[PDB]
Design a protein around this ligand. Structure first.
Ligand code: 151
Ligand code: 151
Ligand SMILES: *[C@@H]1O[C@H](CO[C@@H]2O[C@@H](C)[C@@H](O)[C@@H](O)[C@@H]2O)[C@@H](O)[C@H](O)[C@H]1NC(C)=O
Ligand SMILES: *[C@@H]1O[C@H](CO[C@@H]2O[C@@H](C)[C@@H](O)[C@@H](O)[C@@H]2O)[C@@H](O)[C@H](O)[C@H]1NC(C)=O
Ligand SMILES: *[C@@H]1O[C@H](CO[C@@H]2O[C@@H](C)[C@@H](O)[C@@H](O)[C@@H]2O)[C@@H](O)[C@H](O)[C@H]1NC(C)=O
Ligand SMILES: *[C@@H]1O[C@H](CO[C@@H]2O[C@@H](C)[C@@H](O)[C@@H](O)[C@@H]2O)[C@@H](O)[C@H](O)[C@H]1NC(C)=O
Lengths: 218, 218
């Protein structure tokens, strides 16, 4: 996240860090104690068996007893287009179930079909690239943004930080966009580089995959 | 295919070669003019943007005008388990429609839940390794096989050649197992090495996926 603020320890206990080796590479969201949601692009040309799903994290540079670490057990994708990133979402079943506590909870989703209108105020987050002058985030960051329709496919929910150069960056893909309490997006792509000021960030539209997601976790 | 024979040219017009910048790495089956299915594990650690879906092929070491080449436009997976290969199936939308002809035809499928019993006679095929002497096949190969239920998961359709060392090998994964003219299987995995004479070859049970497949191909 370029130009955001550190988050209050465990303010978003549904937030998940996906790692390979000992390093973060994408975010995800806990939607059922044995299930996460992320961007399809995130798992596309990696060794999924090696992927560690870390729950309950806050500052990746430190040891954290609050963490619950899982592995991937099943993968579901519905029409992901590798060429243009249409339908950039994947549901990952875990090898076990999270212990729901203060630090780990299931986020809630929007009703199938629920469409977002230019103007709504959401919150983006991730441990992604602070920009390019210093690498990845140690502490989870958050960013107020606004839903926008200009320069956005009808197949995406997009955001924009009005007035300055700020937005999601490498390492935030797969992270959730929270609007009035529900996951309305998963971070998918940016244009003109990160935090361009010219183009809105693009998030896969969660509300469009609702019944599908449900036919899987319920 | 270890211990099989050359198939007759364009004997199996639904037979597909998945290639990465000219290099065959797995087979597939044309199930609609614009959809193939193959094994999920086949596209797991490759850049799918670079994958070419090659239709109407016979001899891979030859220039072949009968061929039609498409790219992947969309991806669908339904509970693929990367750790044990359960649900080893992927449906791939193509970036266009194949021209139906002598050398290219949609295959037929079995109806949902149509299981096979010990002893049914099938035919496996593909462009994989010839055995461990001689490399990957040039000309498409075929092999008479028999369905078996011992040393097989309930969630797999499995085959075994009796009385000799023969079976599928690297390069055959994702290829169709034809039984009584319907595609009942997608080549998935082997045990004890290729053509052990000890363990049966395992194929994803297409029939258990027919309803999901129709819903994508509709
Ligand atoms: C993920 O982190 C996204 C953005 C949300 C940051 C990254 C991913 N790429 S990377 C290099 O693996 O981090 C996927 C796309 N991302 C981009 O930074 C990026 C670069 O160009 C684009 C836009 N493209 C892709 C879709 C159409 C145009 N996004
Ligand atoms: C595909 O070509 C299969 C077999 C049908 C040959 C290969 C694939 N692996 S690859 C192309 O060599 O990386 C997928 C598994 N295959 C095997 O050769 C193989 C080796 O060990 C196994 C057994 N595993 C998978 C099930 C759990 C143990 N399969
Ligand atoms: C679920 O997975 C946990 C993580 O396993 C560790 O990381 C994975 C990716 C593999 O590399 C594994 O070999 C590593 O040890 C386990 O530690 C945990 O016990 C598992 N939970 C279960 C099976 O109940
Ligand atoms: C920045 O946003 C903060 C939280 O926003 C609200 O909560 C999140 C979880 C979402 O549900 C979102 O839709 C809500 O609006 C606010 O507390 C804060 O006021 C904001 N600051 C500014 C300057 O806009
Ligand atoms: C469908 O794609 C065909 C194959 O294109 C070739 O392979 C893909 C993976 C890319 O690498 C591409 O740039 C390669 O040349 C095209 O040749 C074909 O025209 C396409 N047809 C469409 C889009 O209708
Ligand atoms: C070898 O198999 C040949 C073809 O088998 C038939 O067609 C295939 C595609 C499947 O649908 C299969 O179930 C059918 O049996 C036979 O014609 C041939 O006789 C077989 N030979 C021996 C010795 O088994």
């Amino acid at each position: 996240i370029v130009g955001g603020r550190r988050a209050r320890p465990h303010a978003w206990p549904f937030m998940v860090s996906l790692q390979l080796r000992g390093g973060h590479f994408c975010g995800a969201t806990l939607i059922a104690p044995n299930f996460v949601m992320s961007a399809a692009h995130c798992v596309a040309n990696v060794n999924v068996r090696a992927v560690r799903v870390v729950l309950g994290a806050h500052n990746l540079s430190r040891r954290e007893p609050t963490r619950q670490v899982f592995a991937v057990q099943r993968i579901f994708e519905n029409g992901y287009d590798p060429v243009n990133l249409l339908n950039d979402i994947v549901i990952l079943q875990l090898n076990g179930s999270a212990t729901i506590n203060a630090n780990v909870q299931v986020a809630q989703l929007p009703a199938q079909g629920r469409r977002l209108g230019n103007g709504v105020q959401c919150l983006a987050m991730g441990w992604g690239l602070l920009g390019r002058n210093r690498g990845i985030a140690s502490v989870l960051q958050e960013l107020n943004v606004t839903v926008v329709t200009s320069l956005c496919r009808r197949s995406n929910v997009c955001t924009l930080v009005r007035g300055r150069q700020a937005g999601v960056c490498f390492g935030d893909s797969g992270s959730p966009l929270v609007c009035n309490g529900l996951i309305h997006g998963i971070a998918s792509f940016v244009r003109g580089g990160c935090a361009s000021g010219l183009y809105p960030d693009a998030f896969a539209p969660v509300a469009q995959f609702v019944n599908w997601i449900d036919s899987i976790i319920q």
